[PDB]
Amino acid sequence: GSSGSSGCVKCNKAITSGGITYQDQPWHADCFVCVTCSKKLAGQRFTAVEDQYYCVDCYKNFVSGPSSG
Ligand SMILES: [Zn+2]
Ligand SMILES: [Zn+2]
């Protein structure tokens, strides 16, 4: 029984009958979270950066921080 669909691009798991699609790509509500605090970006206001996606929470801190590294 070969059971393994492509699914999203994050966790690579089939998308339920109520997920989300970004940039013509299969994404999940949990996978569509910032690569920092893992916040639900879907529906909320987020910023897509060439590198990765950051929620208004992290973004603000990134664009406006004391020291990056
Ligand atoms: Zn996923
Ligand atoms: Zn975040």
Q: Are 53 and 65 in contact (CB under 8 A)?
A: no
Q: Which residues contact 18 (CB under 8 A, 6 or more apart)?
A: none
Cα 12 to ligand 1 centre (Å): 6
SS3 56: helix
Q: Are 32 and 52 in contact (CB under 8 A)?
A: no
Residues whose CB is under 5 A from ligand 1 (ion)? Answer: 8, 10-11, 13, 28, 31
Cα 56 to ligand 2 centre (Å): 7
Ligand with an atom nearest the CA of residue 14: 1
Report the run of H or E that residue 22 belongs to, with start and end: strand 20-22
Amino acid symbol at 63: V
Cα 13 to ligand 1 centre (Å): 5
Domains of the chain (ranges; CATH) run 1-69 (2.10.110.10)
